[PDB]
């Protein structure tokens, strides 16, 4: 799992993208790179023991509609170190870094009942009090809560479900 080796490439690529302001374009470039890594015929090649130069240039020939100067050179660095499989994780961490820089957050709202638009509106306002970032609410419907709303801002969770209140009470006794 490449969670720990993806950070340097994500950070460096994001800083360079910021200096040249084409952050959205860089995200497109990385999305394209992540999808070619999932291909059945490429995922076989990436596991073979080819020398980095040959392997990279095959990938670069396949990777049309990227910028030679910058994006394809990121590809070269990752090929040297044998880390092209880190691209599906470098993409996620680049998106995280962008969300942090743009002071914008994505959070999930979960309930057994489909929420009314006024409920979602007040949720967004309250969350923007709790969180400095603006919030994009994601609606998930799950009968598990049985009632109430589960607020899931990533690792930070506020539980407002009856079932949670019940299984919390059961351990008090």
């Amino acid at each position: 799992e490449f969670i720990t080796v993806a950070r340097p490439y994500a950070k460096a690529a994001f800083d360079f993208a910021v200096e040249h302001q084409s952050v959205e374009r860089w995200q497109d470039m990385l999305a394209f790179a992540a999808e070619v890594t999932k291909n059945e015929q490429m995922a076989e090649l990436l596991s073979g023991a080819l020398a980095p130069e040959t392997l990279a240039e095959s990938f670069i020939a396949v990777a049309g509609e990227q910028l030679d100067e910058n994006g394809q050179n990121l590809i070269r660095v990752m090929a040297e170190n044998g880390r092209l499989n880190a691209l599906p994780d470098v993409l996620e961490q680049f998106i995280h870094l962008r969300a942090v820089s743009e002071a914008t957050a994505e959070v999930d709202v979960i309930s057994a009942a489909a929420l009314s638009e006024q409920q979602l509106a007040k949720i967004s306002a309250a969350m923007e009090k709790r969180l400095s970032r603006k919030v994009k609410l994601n609606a998930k419907i799950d009968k598990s809560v049985m009632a109430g709303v589960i607020i899931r801002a990533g690792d930070m969770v506020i539980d407002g479900s009856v079932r949670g209140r019940l299984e919390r009470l059961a351990d008090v006794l």
Binding site: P8, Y9, K11, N70
Partner: peptide, 10 residues
């Protein structure tokens, strides 16, 4: 492989 060196190579 660390951040500012990678940015230089980028």
């Amino acid at each position: 492989e660390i951040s500012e060196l990678i940015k230089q190579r980028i």
